[PDB]
């Protein structure tokens, strides 16, 4: 639609709105006794113009799929976000004073229990990546008219994740995306490196492919104009502002980040700001054009059972790619993301069959996770990201925040453990189970053959939370019939007899080492029960205990992972205290080195011979 | 010294060297059956000019403190690094053919068991940050003439960590630092985003404050000239190259990343390259000026015992800052790094007393860890980094690689757990124990009062590996006499009687909740033994077991951390199977929310009342 050039009365109303937003931010943080009023105050005109002139959204339905999106990347400015939603009529004005109380949902940083929040922020430098996912979805998946606005601080621009998102938005021509940079000169404990060198910020944004506009961030007129011109590139509004703007004696001063005003000072300051407001009448939000498509919410089912034959050899990494491509034929909601590793994770199979739903994220794992989080907001897509599991450690903070965001994303990490062989430890995932188990909403799948991998992909697609699938490089035999039923939290006993003397729990390559160890032990008339956990989180505690009680109470765990936080610790925590139950662990005890897969499994004590020796020791 | 303008014979010798390096990279990867010859080949002229014209180093003493530093950020090019060290006469030429063998130290990516490797690479995007630490040390700490050279790939430039390092080097005027960008057009699975748009790379580097020079990366003459001009800024040599340069039919082609040449093809290609070499005579390396200072290696001792009084209240975060500043008066080797959080971690105390040894890293945790790793190389400094513990998750891959690098760095993460109160979960560290316990070389300190914090700082300074100190926001009472002896792996029983019915293990805020719970239980004639672990890794298994056997075998753990990978799992894994021993866990079961510290401890079941209720349940 045409830009509506505001008259002087509308401009004054926007100024009055910005000053109301300042007052509310001060009132709320003074009442709470904590918070960041000076960080809200630098953004007050930006927020007024965005919410009451530029954006299009349903004020009574913040999650509506047709709405423009707003991401508060500088999440500690939450009080001004709450204030705008009260100004728009969604939040009760009195509730603002309950900021940070245990009785309120207006928490210290935004979180998705709030209808107006899609992604939790608070860990700086992540909002723009989420916004890129929203804008990519809007332009290429929803094909809708909504736009995406992301407000960042200047200290926040020191985070490399921001520059990954900048580069992504220009690669993918996200002309529906606007980043607003609140260049208020100061960080938490010192000035931001570039201070008010606006030209340097402009050069950096232009070098990364954005259309960059320097504005006076306290001029509602310059802001209306800058937001009012759509571009053919992602657009950076570089706003020169002052921290604590409007707070006499505090504006542009250090020592005030995250410091509320004391009661006596708040009263005096609020009276000053209030005297600037010319009218109490509020501006109404403007609704969006309703062109986002419907999205089905039904269960996603594989079009057929797995087609593997017991005895055939396939690496679970390849079965992942085959299974994801197969699942893509069943539902248009499945999208795949990969970080320049598609040939090795086998997500290239999905790209070949469903190219319009594959997102190349390049060597930028932090941004890739944030893109997926953004794509999953409002349930618009069901994303599967992949790289080597070791490189998901690069995105741990994004994954941590994804759980705080209640996000439903699926991650597949390949090349786990020492069994990759010659590349050496930089490429070996040995802490990924520890990392993903510590994520509160996570489900951790560790499929041991191609059939289990296909079932894990199907289960993950239909499971809420952060789903992780750990895949492996070596080709192992198919051990499961393709009609075997798999469920989250349900383990499988793959070998048992009446005279079993220990239950051996393995997964992936160590499950096949355990089965080979059972064959070595058969020559010595020693039988062992072999258990495949399928999910490491949640663990099938009942089947583990019933197996243990059938094998003299003895459990041996063996895993291609470090000792801490892995399968062995998960099993020990589950069964500690149970009478007669003992647990013995085999794992990788130190940083590995290069060698053939079988040589490394032997060197680090997790191969069939190490398992057999541990079994004999338990019996004697 | 003056630039030595090479004659045509020296230039031809450098070309011959580059071609020998190609041959060795092909020979080694074909013999191994794996590796990245096309990634070596694009860098061959760069490597020849660096090692045999530009750099100054002792060829027989690669770790010498006077040497120029070289960091191979694109670590998968390891075969060409090994080749240059054979060409320089340090490595035997025959050993190159043992690349990736379990019998060799020429592993798939560089690692510090090699005398010529300071930091392990292999996880892309981290080398430049390490190089910044080396260059900062050289300019500001060593005050020596050595220079630092870092070779990066173009796909690698998608990592945000690279841009954090770029910004750091210009902030700190690292005119002794040179980054060489191998712009060979291709990544692993597709072209790099910018391909051969050399002007865009130049604009990005210039916007981040570097002096940027575009060269033909296969012209030894242009490379000699570009390296030969020192600048007043960090300098980026932007080298236009072709992947697989010199391999007929493979140069500039996709589908060859990480693919060795088959034997029959290697023979043919090597014969072609060999026919280009005009002479077998090798160039000798040139030694450096020996102006790096001596550094003492003695134990670092606090100048006095802690000065806290039993009963005084201090937050361990503040005791950390006081203790680090105190330790800085004892040894000039201590340096401190912080990510714009010095007012909240209290590293500002060190900055005030020892400003020349404080490094402000801004909001860039990945780079901060890499800086510390670089500063610790060759034992030049003893670094302590600090931020909120939650934001160390942003640097997990850097910490993981630091352990592969055998690095001795110290990390202090504040604001752990729900006890921070109103900021909410984005700022709460609830997975940091899981993360740091999974790091192979780690020691994890969790001091419960100011005295333990000071002792932990002293111990950490003298302990090899990745040391982590978990500090807390709330002020708790001093419980230890200031002459109490603390040691790694030694726990403390802080309350005991003869009629204790359970051993309660707490740490930080939950240790003080446990002591308060013991007072509640005293009213009911119930005595509990309270144990403070001091180090979570390694755990004092002996004292835990002896305590348990004195309290009917019952252990209760309580921690301000998620259930997985924390204190409870560490204790359970240590004691599982021990007869009569049971372990019960209290931890945080889900993403928290904002509230007062005591309200959140109650809501998440880890306060004195929850501990008392669990104790009563264990007895009955
Ligand atoms: C990843 C991360 N590191 C550190 C912090 C701690 N922190 C919170 S706010 C802040 C300063 C923010 O400065 P800026 O982005 O300039 O925002 P302003 O408040 O000035 O608008 C810092 C360092 C954080 N929240 N996230
Ligand atoms: C952080 C990280 N993510 C992914 C990988 C997987 N990987 C190894 S090499 C490579 C491509 C490297 O491309 P580039 O930097 O252009 O180097 P070249 O071999 O072309 O010189 C990738 C994606 C990695 N090593 N590290
Ligand atoms: O995909 P690469 O591990 O052979
Ligand atoms: O330092 P902040 O948590 O008050
Ligand atoms: Ca700022
Ligand atoms: Ca490349």
UniProtKB/Swiss-Prot annotation, chains A, B:
Changing residue 317 to C: In SDDHD; decreased of transketolase activity. Its cofactor is Mg(2+); Ca(2+); Mn(2+); Co(2+). The record marks 36, 257 as: Important for catalytic activity. Belongs to the transketolase family. Catalyzes the transfer of a two-carbon ketol group from a ketose donor to an aldose acceptor, via a covalent intermediate with the cofactor thiamine pyrophosphate. Homodimer. This is Transketolase.
């Amino acid at each position: 639609e045409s830009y509506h050039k505001p008259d002087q009365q509308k401009l004054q109303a926007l100024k009055d709105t910005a000053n109301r937003l300042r007052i509310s931010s001060i009132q709320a943080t003074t009442a709470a006794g904590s918070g960041h009023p000076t960080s809200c105050c630098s953004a007050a005109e930006i927020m007024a113009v965005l919410f009451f002139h530029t954006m299009r959204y349903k004020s009574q339905d913040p999650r509506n799929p047709h709405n423009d999106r707003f991401v508060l990347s500088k999440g500690h400015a939450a009080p001004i976000l709450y204030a705008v939603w009260a100004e728009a009529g969604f939040l009760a004005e009195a509730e603002l004073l309950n900021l940070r109380k245990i009785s309120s949902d207006l928490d210290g940083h935004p979180v998705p229990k709030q209808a107006f929040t899609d992604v939790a922020t608070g860990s700086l430098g992540q909002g723009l990546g989420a916004a890129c996912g929203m804008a990519y979805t809007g332009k290429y998946f929803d094909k809708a008219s909504y736009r995406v606005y992301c407000l960042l601080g200047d200290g926040e621009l020191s985070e490399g994740s921001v520059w990954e998102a900048m580069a992504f938005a220009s690669i993918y021509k996200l002309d529906n995306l606007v980043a607003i940079l609140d260049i208020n000169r100061l960080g938490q404990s010192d000035p931001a490196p570039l201070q008010h060198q606006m030209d340097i910020y402009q050069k950096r944004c232009e070098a990364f492919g954005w259309h960059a506009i320097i504005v006076d961030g306290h001029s509602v007129e310059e802001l209306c104009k800058a937001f009012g011109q759509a571009k053919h590139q992602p657009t950076a509004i570089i706003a020169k502002t002052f921290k604590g703007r409007g707070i006499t004696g505090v504006e542009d001063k250090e020592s005030w980040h995250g410091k509320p005003l004391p009661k006596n000072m708040a009263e005096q300051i609020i009276q000053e700001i209030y005297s600037q407001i010319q009218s109490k009448k509020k501006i109404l939000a403007t609704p969006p054009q309703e062109d986002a498509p419907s999205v089905d919410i039904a269960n996603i089912r594989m079009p057929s059972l797995p087609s593997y034959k017991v005895g055939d050899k396939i690496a679970t990494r390849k079965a992942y790619g085959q299974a994801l491509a197969k699942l893509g034929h069943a539902s248009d909601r499945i999208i795949a993301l990969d970080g320049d590793t598609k040939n090795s994770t086998f997500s290239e199979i999905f790209k070949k069959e469903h190219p319009d739903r594959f997102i190349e994220c390049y060597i930028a794992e932090q941004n890739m996770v944030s893109i997926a989080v953004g794509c999953a907001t409002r349930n618009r897509t069901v994303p599967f990201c992949s790289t080597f599991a070791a490189f998901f450690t690069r995105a741990f903070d994004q994954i941590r925040m994804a759980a705080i965001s209640e996000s439903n994303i699926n991650l597949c990490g390949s090349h786990c453990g020492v069994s990759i062989g010659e590349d050496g430890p930089s490429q070996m995932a040995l802490e990924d189970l520890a990392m993903f188990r510590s994520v509160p909403t996570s489900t951790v799948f560790y499929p041991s053959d191609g059939v289990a991998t296909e079932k894990a992909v199907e289960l993950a697609a239909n499971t809420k939370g952060i789903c992780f699938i750990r895949t492996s490089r070596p080709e192992n035999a198919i051990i499961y019939n393709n009609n075997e039923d798999f469920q989250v939290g349900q383990a499988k006993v793959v070998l048992k007899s009446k005279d079993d003397q220990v239950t051996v729990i393995g997964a992936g390559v160590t499950l096949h080492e355990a089965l080979a160890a059972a064959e070595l032990l058969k020559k010595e008339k020693i039988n062992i029960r072999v258990l495949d956990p399928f999910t490491i989180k949640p663990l099938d505690r009942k089947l583990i205990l019933d197996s243990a009680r059938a094998t003299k109470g003895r459990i041996l765990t063996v895993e291609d992972h470090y000792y801490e936080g892995g399968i062995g610790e998960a099993v020990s925590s589950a069964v500690v205290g149970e009478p007669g139950i003992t647990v013995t662990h085999l794992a990788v005890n130190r940083v590995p080195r290069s060698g053939k897969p079988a040589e490394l499994l032997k060197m680090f004590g997790i191969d069939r011979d190490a398992i057999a020796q541990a079994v004999r020791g338990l019996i004697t």
